[PDB]
């Protein structure tokens, strides 16, 4: 059994002093993170929202997440969204405008987390517009935050669902 462990980043919110442009227990981002021979290794990040859990399917994988002294245990999961619940249902109903600009909560996996405001590019697909967030920044920055304006998360970095 991996030993995968979360711990809080800091806390979710819209920074105004911002860097705009393109130079790539308790609600918050947490840095997902499983016990290695040498040391802890960042595989993931989460949002904590309402005392549910949300995350990539592919960094959790369905394991067994240790928070504190308690385990705290998926409830909902969907392999081609590449999204995982723990501990209740989906809890992230925020939509991009699909016009406004978005600041993305990245976690570098060895860097403390900071607020990059980008555009999302929009391409066209067969269930709607979508948008598209890809920047320079590691794997295990995967499942990072993305928040609009009000400070509320519409997508996590991995994919930005737009509804106007
Ligand atoms: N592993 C990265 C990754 C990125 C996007 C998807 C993805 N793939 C296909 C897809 N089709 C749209 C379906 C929606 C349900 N009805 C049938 C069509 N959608 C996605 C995708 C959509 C939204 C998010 C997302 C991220 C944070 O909040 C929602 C993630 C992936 C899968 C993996």
Do not use: C
């Amino acid at each position: 059994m991996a030993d995968l462990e979360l711990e809080r980043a800091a806390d979710v919110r819209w920074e105004e002093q911002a860097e705009i442009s393109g130079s790539s227990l308790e609600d918050g981002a947490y840095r997902i993170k499983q016990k290695g021979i040498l040391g802890y290794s960042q595989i993931g990040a989460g949002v904590y929202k309402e005392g549910t859990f949300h995350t990539m399917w592919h960094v959790t994988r369905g394991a067994v997440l240790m928070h504190k002294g308690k385990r705290i245990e998926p409830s909902w999961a969907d392999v081609k969204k590449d999204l995982i619940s723990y501990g209740g249902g989906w809890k992230l109903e925020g939509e991009w405008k699909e016009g406004e600009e978005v600041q993305v909560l990245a976690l570098e996996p060895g860097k403390n987390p900071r607020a990059v405001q980008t555009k999302p590019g929009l391409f066209k697909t067969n269930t709607g517009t979508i948008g598209a967030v890809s920047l320079d920044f590691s794997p295990g920055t995967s499942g990072s935050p993305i928040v609009d304006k009000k400070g509320k998360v519409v997508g996590l970095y991995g994919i930005a669902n737009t509804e106007k």
